[PDB]
Amino acid sequence: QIRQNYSTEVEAAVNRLVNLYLRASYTYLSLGFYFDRDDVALCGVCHFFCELAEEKREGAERLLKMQNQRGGRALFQDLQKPSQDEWGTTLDAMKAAIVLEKSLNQALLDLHALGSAQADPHLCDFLESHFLDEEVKLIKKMGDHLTNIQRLVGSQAGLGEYLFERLTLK
Template identity: 45%
Template sequence: MQSAVKHSLHSESEAAINKLINIKLTASYTHVSLGMYSDRHDVALPNFSRFFLELSEKEREQAESLLEYQNLRGGRVLLQNIAKPSREDWKGGLDAFSFSLEYQKSLNNSLQDVHHIASTHTDPHVSFYFFTHFLLDSHETIKKLGDHISILMRLRSSEPNGQMGEYLFDRHTL
């Protein structure tokens, strides 16, 4: 049955939003994995853990925002299975941040895809919503992750395996 409030929401935009909801929930799950990795006794980087868990929370909140937006526009929410993270272990904080950066770039591509679909179907509301609520934030997160990686690489370059640099970064930067 067609929603009484659905107006100018193209079915392709509706499907793309549903796909993005799943992507955001998977991202939240993946960042929980990164946070728990950082909190393990053999890694012991509590501020790395806090950073990743905050990213997880932000992704979950954005997924909830998309759910609410889909309902607001009269679309149908179709939840999908959430895939487990593609990795379960990392080689330290720098590897975890590098993984998160690449993951965030792929999330940004998914956001741009939805923005493009909305633009193609002349839906300025979806375009504006995604630009203001998601794309700008995504670019800021990519910048922050890149900055952290640059600092970590400089700290690690002064010692053979970089563990002291990660420890100092965890204690004094995050």
């Protein structure tokens, strides 16, 4: 037995966070293919979201690996379908993505608070090394996108949406 200073509460919260990252991965998968539709056709937006799907899956896998390293047991639940089947405009999609990220970030913060209360400094190191800063960086990038998309909706919404995709998402 390797397990040491690893609470059942942390263990459960880690499994839940795995589920959240995989669901976020699935949502980005859905976002990406929506933007590849022939009637939506924003290549840059598709690529931005499909790269996010991959990053979220890798996040989940790092959690799992850590679960195993600590002597916890991975438990998998259903992955709930994404919150929408169609994602509207690039603006709507980027808003949906930032809401999703802030929810992941809150989960990460709830898990740090749990780790601190349980006195689990390995867990806190883990999250600091691989999660907190990356999530902050992503959220800042999404905020930057949203600001640029918004400046580009004048009365020429189609034009702005094309330009953003061609000149930022490049």
